[PDB]
């Protein structure tokens, strides 16, 4: 999982040169956004269950998906779906802290389309529910973090589609 | 970075970053300005650090610069000094990152295998980094030098 700092030092390392002043400028920028990123991560961690509960209620509950034959019907499948929403929230939060979508690419989105298509999971509905999580999360952490949590949530949706 | 090392060890247990880890990142980002200064000073003095430390290493362990050692002749001796420069650079990356992760992945994993297959005394390499640590102590303020000394210590710890 490359973060902003690890990515900057890696790029400088590939060139071989010691850390440049311009690279220091980029690192200073990430350090500046550190306060909002850490604060938002703490908020998400505490309210994680409520984020998912609100998103499931807004998008998935009382639809065909949650009624017989809909792929969220069986108690097994319902628990699995909420677990997946927790996955997306947790790794989006990791991505926000890092400032880098590499963790999403490497761990979350690799073969996600193939696993879901093999299992029979509706990828359209998963995209819609991730959007509901994006909206709830944006409300909880405010426009500053919601803008960034938005880019990482939308990264997931773009790949998952 | 300290951020990724926290995330990685939390991902293993499948938890959101726990409050202590979040506090650690908070402190690290706040003192990042100090860290960048420390790396700036070492970067600026890199030529002197390498030159002085190389002379000290060769003096303490003359066998490496004697015939039949890895660094005999100006060609091989220059490459040895470059390796010392490499490890100074990796230590600067470590200071800025706040963790030993850049040091570990770039240049502490497989060191035994690489240097053994190059015909180089790894304990001598460790002493060279020790010499660089002393030079760095001279060029850094006491509180900063203690922190940078930790990264030098990690390099020598894996080396020997």
């Amino acid at each position: 999982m490359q973060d902003a700092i690890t990515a900057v030092i890696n790029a400088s390392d590939v060139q071989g040169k010691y850390l440049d002043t311009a690279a220091m400028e980029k690192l200073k920028a990430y350090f500046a956004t550190g306060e909002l990123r850490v604060r938002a991560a703490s908020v998400i961690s505490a309210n994680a269950a409520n984020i998912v509960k609100e998103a499931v209620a807004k998008s998935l509950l009382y639809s065909d998906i949650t009624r017989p034959g809909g792929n969220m019907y069986t108690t097994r499948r319902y628990a699995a779906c909420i677990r997946d929403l927790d996955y997306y929230l947790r790794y989006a939060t990791y991505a926000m802290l890092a400032g880098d979508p590499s963790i999403l690419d490497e761990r979350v989105l690799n073969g996600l389309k193939e696993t879901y298509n093999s299992l029979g999971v509706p990828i359209a509905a998963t995209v819609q529910a991730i959007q509901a999580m994006k909206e709830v999360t944006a409300s909880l952490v405010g426009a500053d973090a919601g803008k960034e949590m938005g880019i990482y949530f939308d990264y997931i949706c773009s790949g998952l589609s | 970075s300290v951020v990724t090392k926290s995330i990685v060890n939390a991902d293993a247990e499948a938890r959101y970053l726990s409050p202590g880890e979040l506090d650690r990142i908070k402190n690290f980002v706040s003192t990042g300005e100090r860290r960048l200064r420390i790396a700036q000073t070492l970067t600026e003095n890199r030529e002197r650090i390498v030159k002085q430390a190389g002379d000290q290493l060769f003096q303490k362990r003359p066998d490496v610069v004697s015939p039949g050692g890895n660094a005999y002749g100006e060609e091989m001796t220059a490459t040895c000094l470059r390796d010392l420069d490499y490890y100074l650079r990796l230590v600067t990356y470590g200071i800025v990152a706040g963790d030993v992760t850049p040091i570990e992945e770039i240049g502490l994993v497989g060191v035994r295998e690489m240097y053994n297959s190059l015909g180089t005394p790894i304990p001598a390499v460790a002493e060279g980094i020790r010499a660089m640590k002393n030079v760095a102590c001279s060029l850094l303020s006491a509180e900063d030098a203690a922190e940078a000394g930790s990264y030098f210590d990690f390099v020598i710890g894996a080396m020997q």
Partner: peptide, 29 residues
């Protein structure tokens, strides 16, 4: 069961798969 997955429920390694998975043979004496 997907609730019991080492990625998400790392502790519950050893909770039997059950009727949803393979048979688990254990030696008793």
């Amino acid at each position: 069961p997907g609730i019991n997955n080492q990625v998400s429920n790392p502790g519950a390694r050893g909770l039997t798969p059950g009727t949803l998975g393979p048979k688990v043979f254990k030696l008793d004496q």
